[PDB]
Amino acid sequence: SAGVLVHYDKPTNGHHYLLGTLTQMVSAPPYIINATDAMLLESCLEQFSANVRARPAQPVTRLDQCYHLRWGAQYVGEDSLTYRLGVLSLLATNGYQLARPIPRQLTNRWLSSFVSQIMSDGVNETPLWPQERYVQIAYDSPSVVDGATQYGYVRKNQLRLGMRISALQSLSDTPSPVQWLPQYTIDQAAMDEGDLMVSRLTQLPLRPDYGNIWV
Amino acid sequence: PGGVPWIAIGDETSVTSPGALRRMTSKDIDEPLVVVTEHAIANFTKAEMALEFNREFLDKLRVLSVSPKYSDLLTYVDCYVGVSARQALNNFQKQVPVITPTRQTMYVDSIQAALKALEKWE
Amino acid sequence: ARAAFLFKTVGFGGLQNVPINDELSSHLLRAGNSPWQLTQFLDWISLGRGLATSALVPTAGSRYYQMSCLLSGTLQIPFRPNHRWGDIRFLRLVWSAPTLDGLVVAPPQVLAQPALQAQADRVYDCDDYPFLARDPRFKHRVYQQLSAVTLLNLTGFGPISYVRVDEDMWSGDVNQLLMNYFGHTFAEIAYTLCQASANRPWEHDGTYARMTQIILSLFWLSYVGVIHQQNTYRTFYFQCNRRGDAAEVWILSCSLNHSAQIRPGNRSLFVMPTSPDWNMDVNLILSSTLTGCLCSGSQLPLIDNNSVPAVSRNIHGWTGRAGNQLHGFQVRRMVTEFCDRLRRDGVMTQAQQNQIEALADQTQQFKRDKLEAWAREDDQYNQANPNSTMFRTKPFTNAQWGRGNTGATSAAIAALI
Amino acid sequence: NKKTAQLLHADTPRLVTWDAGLCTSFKIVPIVPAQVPQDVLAYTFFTSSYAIQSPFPEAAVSRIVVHTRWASNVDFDRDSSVIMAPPTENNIHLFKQLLNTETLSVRGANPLMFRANVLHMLLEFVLDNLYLNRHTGFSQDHTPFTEGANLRSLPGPDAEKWYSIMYPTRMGTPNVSKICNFVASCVRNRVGRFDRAQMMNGAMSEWVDVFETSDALTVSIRGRWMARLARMNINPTEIEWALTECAQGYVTVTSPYAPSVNRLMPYRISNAERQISQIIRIMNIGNNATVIQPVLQDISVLLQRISPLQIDPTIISNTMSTVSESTTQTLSPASSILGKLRPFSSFRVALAGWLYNGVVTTVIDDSSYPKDGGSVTSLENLWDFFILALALPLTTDPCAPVKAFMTLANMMVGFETIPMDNQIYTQSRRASAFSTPHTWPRCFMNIQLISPIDAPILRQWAEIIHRYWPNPSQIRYGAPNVFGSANLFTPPEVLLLPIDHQPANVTTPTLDFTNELTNWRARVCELMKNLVDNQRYQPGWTQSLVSSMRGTLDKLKLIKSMTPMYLQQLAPVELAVIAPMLPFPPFQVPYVRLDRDRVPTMVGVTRQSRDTITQPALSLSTTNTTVGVPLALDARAITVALLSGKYPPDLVTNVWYADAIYPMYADTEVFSNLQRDMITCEAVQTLVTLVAQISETQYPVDRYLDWIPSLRASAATAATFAEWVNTSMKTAFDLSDMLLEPLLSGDPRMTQLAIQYQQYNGRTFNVIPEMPGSVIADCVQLTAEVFNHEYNLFGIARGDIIIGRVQSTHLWSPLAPPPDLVFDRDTPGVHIFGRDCRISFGMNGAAPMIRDETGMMVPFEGNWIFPLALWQMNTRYFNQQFDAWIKTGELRIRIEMGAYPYMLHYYDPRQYANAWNLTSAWLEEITPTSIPSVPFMVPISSDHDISSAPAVQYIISTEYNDRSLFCTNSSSPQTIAGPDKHIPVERYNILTNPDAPPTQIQLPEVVDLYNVVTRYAYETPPITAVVMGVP
């Protein structure tokens, strides 16, 4: 019932079976978090951070930096944060990078906001679905962890992900808006749909400063 | 009906992205699998009718008295269906008539052989 | 210890449908809806009074064969791509729950609905179903039946019997535990041991596992005449007073001044007798059950791919390119081997061995005639009811009546010592 | 109270039964004597003239008869005997003994009830045959009748009659009589013990095989009984290991190693069967609190005996003497605390609730709750808060911690206030009012929602609860190899613990204060001390009083007690050791430190299934029954116990526990109860099978005796039949304990078994049992098939009859008259009659006509076919209208009955006889729902041919049914007159055919009356005989 998810990449003192305790932390506004979820979240964030600063000749602490649930599967549901976190852990293993710009250290407030966005419910774009039969490895994934793994890890030869490999440079924030070059497309649509879409996204209405026509 | 059979590339019944899908293979049931058009079936049926038109000579020739019955070869199944992967992802279908090209070829070759044999009587 | 669970569905021998009728399924489910029961496969028979002969069950093996066909159709429903457990009726059979512990009469709308279109020779992997994967103990317990069925399906001819020898099995007070059954008949000991294994799973190298292996080894050596009062193993041997008896049972026995000599080493293998009388052979089926439990407990070496049908070659859990070779022995010829070894030892007169052989010939002729007659009746029934065609037992040939190198296999067993 | 008694122990059935008589339920009876002596035939010709004992009866007519245990001599009577009387006599009362409530007439019976009665008859025959056959003895023959064979020798004299019957071949054949010829046909060599288990040094045969007269079918029933018993057998070494493991080293038992000597120890059954019996047990105990109270007292006594811990009141007096004050103080906290004390079994009950938390929740006595709810100005109320604070962590109320927080919150209302969820649960709401997780305030979930500045004490209390709530643990328990698993909603061997366990290292430990309970006590005292140090609260209290109160709180934190240490290590060991002795297995629910969502809120059970739902999980939600009850405790006594724990001064854990355990380890009740539950499970399956024969269920059913008529069954008839089966089953096992009661509740045609429970999040957990195999079911199907083969053998008549006048010199069988004289429904000129047919009176001598079922109108003569029921409806009118036409008229009618009782009437062939008057009586006495057994009149067979004499008969059967005859004129060498019948070869095939296999059976075509029997001498010694406990 406590359930077991572990980083199989290194046994600190040997294989260790983590079990979730009764204690859970809701200290982060406003979500309530089980110990299992908190550990998974930190490990997952660390893995994503590793992908962000990935260096070709730079060594990693563990090729496997994600806890994977070995036991407690009957107590585990897809809708649960833990299940999505496992999908995210698999994505981190594949090296997946978050579209939103990532700070070197996510703020506690930033971490909470990230949790809130994860809380936003949507179709999961990644097609990975968990198997306790074995850890699933993509055939074309960039990292060598599958070669490193000796037990419990399986790479599907038919499993190939069609995504390019790219890591961006410094992405600091910008104070004021700037022009974006716009190009139109041949597709045509009803004016009414556009009006309704504008009403959904309109910032109207408010009072701006007039300024001076002549000086 | 039209298109080709598509099977989930990795997870059965949990397919959402095109990446999750692949052309269904004969080994999944590796010869070709194709959706059979009703129009083609009706035309083969008309062909069999022409054979019945030439039935007397073939019987007098004591050869292949049994009519072909093309409808027997048709196989109908529920599955994701599309000419391309995108359609099948948005186009799951039920009871689609299907057959392999080689079987169709054998059937046609038999019909052609029959026409060649009936050549003199007509 | 076996770690991979998979099974392959039975293929009809030129049949277009499972060879069972609803009448047969009802007879099998006389009062129960769970086929997992071992007694469900076979009404336990104590030998002598052993052997179930019925209009639907000429042999207990016949009943097991029908059960296997029915299970192969029913199991496909939760093993379907949907893996649904209650939506459709296979021949009006609906699983009670997702774990598929029990089956039930199909709902009337479902009864109206068509049965699952099972495909023959479908190899399946147990892990594919989630609930079974969720319970390892449940999965292993279910797998004992699956393993026995697969083994019968694997043998085109008669089923092999797995025999292994370990002196470390002799070592221990577990030997004293085996000595608890001293003076017990092999059949009685086997029923109790099987019940104990059913009660709980045991270690692949478990003391119980070694004991079962020793019991099987002693019984087979005695059956071949390999071990006798004049050839005792540590003085311990299963002894059957009269060979060819209706329920001749080697019973644990001790002989003084006649200790046998065994080559040091570990030897594990399976031997499949040529004779088709095995359907009426209680010892063979009991041995098959024990061997299957042994396979669930421990993963044996894959048998030779050439030793297996080409279609089943390279089975991940069962068949390997290099593997043991099945040994085929006619039961009558094997009884002759037991008699010959004793005659060669001089324990018994040549005349006595000849008398035993004559009794065996008489028994064999009677059984062969009955089996051939049942075969004619079955063919007549199949012609009579194409709609409800079924097989009382897997079909058999007069070819099985031959020794089939029983003597070569006997030399092999003697060499195994 | 019977349910509590059943939980404690079960009525003991007589499992082992041994038969010293013959294992047979059938004996041949003589029917008609021969015409002897006669002048022409020398009496010297007949062997019977010397009155020489014969293997079979010597008579002109004789038939086989069923007489269950007619020759049996048994230690225990199963009291299920079935005897069919001769066909010339009426047994309808047995046939009508079940549902013929309105049947006043003795002869009349209702046809529909017949199938149930016949089925019950088969079941009783099985019940009467449940015996173990003890290996018998043989004696070498001292005479030349046999070649010195070893004959099974019975105790008592006059066994020679048995010897001659067992071996008719032993009879000599100077005569050429039919008996002599049959004996000559029988194989000479198949006599004496067939085989025996004899070879080992000083070992007699455990079993022996022998040829003897007998019946395989009862032998088969006994064989299945032996098979089931053999299935349950366990070995002494296994028992030695189990007892030693249960002792856990406190006690040691030992068993020797020796060759198999044959000891029967049947104790192995599936855990599923045990869970099923427990589920029925929970069903019976649902909603009855009084049942658990005696159980708690019993458990309390067991705990009281096992624990070495002792209550020491002097501790309280010492701590109170430590409370110190000057004469000047206005109030005494020591006096107040003593009053708060206001001063074991309660401790034991709460602990039992830990193991039985699954079905019971502990709660404090209402009188403990402060009447005014507490006042900040009352030190006594602060003491009340402290006592409650100590108890709540030991209470199992799901909201107890939140309730305690509220209790403090309720006291602080207006001094310190908190943000509640809504007005309904307002801050003036009683803390006890908040009985659900929903009551837990959102502000209680969010501590930051509370201002520490505006609510410092409350904020501190909340922080302490979050950082200091006790941590539970779990323990492994139970023996799977022998005792299996009693766990219901949890994994096997798991026992929940209210707190995490750290082990003690000494048999004589020293007091330890590093305890979660000790930490809790210290935290509570510190919180109270800070409340005292409150700037707005301290000024009222005297500075001297303040110092005294602070010191008292410090002393309470420092109080020395052994209870926490005992609970931490010894309590779990004691509980694990006690668990085996408990009659009722524990019911537990997972302990969540703060996981309210997983708190269980509902429990449901289904003992029946939905009309369309065949999956138990799908129908359980609408077919399950809610359950669950609370337990009330006194916090004061428990708090005092916690405050005054003391161990024996010279306490050595190993010695004390070992000494208590040796006497303690004498429990065998579980195995006996298991056998009773196992029998109850067989009864359940047998009941369902009988219901299946009588009803159509969701499970598919087979029917092959449907040719026997049966009524449409309503739930009322269903209950009557079920009640009859239950009563008979209970009587046959001689057990009076509750059986089938849950199944009897409601309609059992669609009943299904499952149970479920539901958590706060609403997730529910189901439990569906899988039945083990039943020998009874296989036997019933076999008997039904056998009855179908031999209904006549049960004295049962199948087919229809034809009432028509027949007088001739031919001597046809009333059951087998000549075919050229017979007619049937399909015969020409025969009329079938339906409701539409009517009758037109004749006039002026003109022909009257009866309207046809098709409306054709003709007079009462010729060939007709009458539904028997239609005549029964109009018996008086029909007897009045057709009796003259039936007696002398050409009218011929075939009566349709399908199945009916028949009776035999013999007559002297020498004199003319007319049966019209007797037939007239039978038809006239026919009733629409009831009639007497159909009567057949048969002439007396003779030993010589004579010219025929006139006879008139009116009734014939539709099918041959005279197979019951065993032999004719057996006293004579040959049958010279009348029907000729030889002893049936098929019934003695093992002897008649030398080439036939010994084990070959002719079932179900023929029942062999001579069989080879195996008799066992296996021993059933007591465990204490081979297993010795070693101190």
The two structure tokens encoding residue D34: 């021969």
Please choose, from the candidates C59, C81, C268, the residue with its C-alpha nearest in 3D space to the C-alpha of residue C163.
C268
| DSSP 8-class letter at D187 | -
How far does the CA of residue A21 sit from the closest CA of chain D (Å)?
A: 9
Q: Print the SS3 string covering D280-319.
A: HHHHHHCCCHHHHHHHHHHHHHHHHHHCCCEECCHHHHHH
Q: In what order do the strands lie in the sheet with D207-213?
A: D192-196, D207-213, D1010-1016
Please choose, from the candidates C142, C140, C216, C191, the residue with its C-alpha nearest in 3D space to the C-alpha of residue D268.
C191
How far does the CA of residue A67 sit from the closest CA of chain C (Å)?
A: 19
Count of beta carbons in the 10 Å neighbourhood of residue D810? 11
How far does the CA of residue D389 sit from the closest CA of chain C (Å)?
A: 42
| DSSP 8-class letter at D456 | H
The two structure tokens encoding residue D980: 């000729």
Chain C environment of D237 (Cβ under 8 Å): 176-177, 180
Pairing of strands C161-165, C123-125: unpaired
| Among D497, D594, D760, D761, the residue to mutate for chain A (most A Cβ within 10 A) | D594
Q: Nearest-5° angle of CA C102, CA C107, CA C108?
A: 155
Q: Cis check for the bond before A30: say yes or no (omega within 30 of 0).
A: yes
Cβ distance C246 to D999 less than 8 Å, yes or no, reads yes
Listed in sequence order, the residues at least 6 apart from D373 whose beta carbon sits closer than 8 Å to its beta carbon are D407, D410, D411, D430
State how far the Cα of D72 lies from the Cα of D52, in Å rounded to an integer: 25
The two structure tokens encoding residue C6: 């998979």
- The distance of Cα A191 from the centroid of its chain, to the nearest Å, equals 37
CB D615 within 8 A of CB C96: yes
Compare CB distances from A123 to B9, B16, B19 and report the shortest one's residue.
B16
Say which amino acid occupies D629: V
The two structure tokens encoding residue B40: 């083609």
State how far the Cα of C151 lies from the Cα of C153, in Å rounded to an integer: 5
Instruction: Find, in chain A, the residue whose alpha carbon is nearest to that of D472.
Output: A22
- The distance of Cα D310 from the centroid of its chain, to the nearest Å, equals 45
CB C279 within 8 A of CB C393: yes
Give contacts of D 597-626 with C, CB under 8 A: 612, 614-618
Name beta bridge partners: B120: none
Burial A110-135 (b: 16+ CB within 10 A, else e): ebeebbeebeeeeebebbbbbebeeb
Compare CB distances from D592 to A22, A30, A32 and report the shortest one's residue.
A22
Q: Nearest-5° angle of CA D129, CA D131, CA D136?
A: 120
| DSSP 8-class letter at D378 | -
State how far the Cα of D109 lies from the Cα of D117, in Å rounded to an integer: 12
State how far the Cα of B70 lies from the Cα of A69, in Å rounded to an integer: 54
Helix (DSSP H) and strand (DSSP E) numbers for chain A: 5, 6
| Among D239, D257, D263, D704, the residue to mutate for chain C (most C Cβ within 10 A) | D257
Please give the C-alpha separations between residue B114 and each of B64, B65, B70, B120, in angstroms, as whole numbers.
Answer: 8, 11, 14, 11
CB A103 within 8 A of CB A55: no
CB D412 within 8 A of CB D458: yes
What are the percentages of helix, strand and coil residues in chain B, rounded to 5?
40, 20, 35
Place of tokens 């020779």: C121
Q: What is the CA radius of gyration of chain C?
A: 22
The two structure tokens encoding residue D467: 């950082």
State how far the Cα of B58 lies from the Cα of D807, in Å rounded to an integer: 73
The two structure tokens encoding residue D462: 């909340």
Does chain D touch chain C (at least 3 C-beta pairs within 8 Å)?
Answer: yes
Please choose, from the candidates C48, C278, C362, the residue with its C-alpha nearest in 3D space to the C-alpha of residue D999.
C48
* Angle formed by the axes of helices C406-416 and C207-224, nearest 10°: 130
Counting Cα atoms < 13 Å in the Cβ hemisphere of C224 gives 27
Stated length of chain A: 215
State how far the Cα of C409 lies from the Cα of C271, in Å rounded to an integer: 8
The two structure tokens encoding residue D146: 């046999």
Please choose, from the candidates C180, C238, C226, the residue with its C-alpha nearest in 3D space to the C-alpha of residue C339.
C226
Helix (H, G, I), strand (E, B) or coil at D565: helix
How far does the CA of residue A1 sit from the closest CA of chain D (Å)?
A: 10
What are the percentages of helix, strand and coil residues in chain C, rounded to 5?
45, 10, 45
How far does the CA of residue C119 sit from the closest CA of chain B (Å)?
A: 10
State how far the Cα of C331 lies from the Cα of C400, in Å rounded to an integer: 11
Place of tokens 């502990």: D362
Q: Print the SS3 string covering D769-783.
A: CCCCCCHHHHHHHHH
The two structure tokens encoding residue D114: 């017949």
Count Cβ–Cβ pairs < 8 Å, chain A vs chain D.
20
**Residue B65 burial by Cβ neighbours in a 10 Å radius (0-12, 13-18, 19+):** exposed
| DSSP 8-class letter at D18 | B
Count Cβ–Cβ pairs < 8 Å, chain C vs chain D.
130
CB D283 within 8 A of CB D606: no
Per the rule left: phi > 0, alpha: psi between -120 and 50, beta: everything else, D829 is: left
Chain B environment of C81 (Cβ under 8 Å): 12-13
How far does the CA of residue D593 sit from the closest CA of chain A (Å)?
A: 5
Chain A environment of D594 (Cβ under 8 Å): 22-24
Name beta bridge partners: D30: D62
In D413-565, alpha helices (H): 442-445, 456-468, 516-532, 543-557, 563-565
Does chain D touch chain B (at least 3 C-beta pairs within 8 Å)?
Answer: no
Pairing of strands D902-907, D857-858: unpaired
Answer whether B13 touches C (CB < 8 Å): yes
Cβ distance C134 to A73 less than 8 Å, yes or no, reads yes
CB B37 within 8 A of CB B31: no
DSSP output for D867-894? EHHHHHHTHHHHHHHHHHHHHHSS-EEE
What are the φ and ψ backbone dihedral angles of D310, each rounded to 5 degrees? Answer: -130, 145
Place of tokens 């052993």: C50
Instruction: Find, in chain C, the residue whose alpha carbon is nearest to that of A70.
Output: C134
Cβ distance B11 to A129 less than 8 Å, yes or no, reads yes
Strands (E) in chain A, as ranges, are 4-6, 24-25, 33-34, 68-71, 135-138, 153-156
State how far the Cα of C62 lies from the Cα of C158, in Å rounded to an integer: 14
Listed in sequence order, the residues at least 6 apart from C184 whose beta carbon sits closer than 8 Å to its beta carbon are C192, C251, C252, D260, D262
**Residue D677 burial by Cβ neighbours in a 10 Å radius (0-12, 13-18, 19+):** buried
Please choose, from the candidates D127, D246, D339, D334, the residue with its C-alpha nearest in 3D space to the C-alpha of residue D779.
D127
Counting Cα atoms < 13 Å in the Cβ hemisphere of C325 gives 9
CB D215 within 8 A of CB D634: no
Helix (H, G, I), strand (E, B) or coil at D658: helix
Please choose, from the candidates D97, D123, D91, the residue with its C-alpha nearest in 3D space to the C-alpha of residue D110.
D97
Strands (E) in D636-747, as ranges, are 645-646
State how far the Cα of C107 lies from the Cα of C95, in Å rounded to an integer: 11
What are the φ and ψ backbone dihedral angles of D1009, each rounded to 5 degrees? Answer: -100, 5
Q: What is the dihedral of CA A173, A174, A178, A182, to 10 degrees?
A: 0
Q: What is the maximal distance between C-alpha atoms in chain C? A: 74
Cβ distance A22 to D590 less than 8 Å, yes or no, reads no
Per the rule left: phi > 0, alpha: psi between -120 and 50, beta: everything else, B17 is: beta
Q: Cis check for the bond before D1004: say yes or no (omega within 30 of 0).
A: yes
Please choose, from the candidates B95, B83, B107, B114, the residue with its C-alpha nearest in 3D space to the C-alpha of residue B38.
B95
In D492-634, alpha helices (H): 516-532, 543-557, 563-565, 571-581, 616-623
DSSP output for B13-27? T---SGGGEEE--TT
Cβ distance D768 to C51 less than 8 Å, yes or no, reads no
Compare CB distances from B10 to A125, A127, A162 and report the shortest one's residue.
A127
* Angle formed by the axes of helices D715-733 and D114-128, nearest 10°: 20
State how far the Cα of D708 lies from the Cα of C285, in Å rounded to an integer: 39
Per the rule left: phi > 0, alpha: psi between -120 and 50, beta: everything else, D635 is: alpha
Cβ distance A129 to B10 less than 8 Å, yes or no, reads yes
Say which amino acid occupies B43: N
- The distance of Cα A171 from the centroid of its chain, to the nearest Å, equals 18
Please choose, from the candidates D101, D105, D79, the residue with its C-alpha nearest in 3D space to the C-alpha of residue D90.
D105
DSSP output for A45-84? HHHHHHHHT--TT---S-S--S-EEEE-GGG--TTSHHHH
| DSSP 8-class letter at C116 | P
State how far the Cα of A60 lies from the Cα of D641, in Å rounded to an integer: 58
Listed in sequence order, the residues at least 6 apart from C149 whose beta carbon sits closer than 8 Å to its beta carbon are C7, C10, C68, C71, C72
Pairing of strands B34-35, B92-99: antiparallel
CB D136 within 8 A of CB D151: no
CB A172 within 8 A of CB A59: no
Q: What is the dihedral of CA A12, A17, A20, A23, to 10 degrees?
A: -50
Answer whether D591 touches A (CB < 8 Å): yes
Resolution rounded to one decimal, in angstroms:
6.5
Burial C285-299 (b: 16+ CB within 10 A, else e): bbbbbbbbbbbbbbe
CB A158 within 8 A of CB B11: no
CB D748 within 8 A of CB D698: no
Q: What is the CA radius of gyration of chain D?
A: 42
| Alpha carbon distance, N-terminus to C-terminus of chain D | 38
CB D674 within 8 A of CB D595: no
The two structure tokens encoding residue D857: 């109108």
Please choose, from the candidates D622, D863, D677, D763, the residue with its C-alpha nearest in 3D space to the C-alpha of residue D280.
D677
Listed in sequence order, the residues at least 6 apart from D105 whose beta carbon sits closer than 8 Å to its beta carbon are D927, D930, D932
Chain B environment of C82 (Cβ under 8 Å): 13
**Residue B94 burial by Cβ neighbours in a 10 Å radius (0-12, 13-18, 19+):** exposed
How far does the CA of residue A133 sit from the closest CA of chain C (Å)?
A: 7
Q: What is the CA radius of gyration of chain B?
A: 19
State how far the Cα of C372 lies from the Cα of C274, in Å rounded to an integer: 16
Say which amino acid occupies A105: Q
Name beta bridge partners: B7: B22
The two structure tokens encoding residue B77: 């199944």
Instruction: Find, in chain A, the residue whose alpha carbon is nearest to that of D471.
Output: A22
How far does the CA of residue C229 sit from the closest CA of chain A (Å)?
A: 51
Sign of the C-alpha dihedral computed for residues D511, D513, D516 and D520 taken in this order: positive
The two structure tokens encoding residue C78: 């939760």
Please choose, from the candidates B83, B112, B97, the residue with its C-alpha nearest in 3D space to the C-alpha of residue B37.
B97
Answer whether D761 touches A (CB < 8 Å): no
CB B99 within 8 A of CB B74: yes
Burial A32-66 (b: 16+ CB within 10 A, else e): ebbbbbebbbebbbebbbbbbeeeeeeeeebbbbb
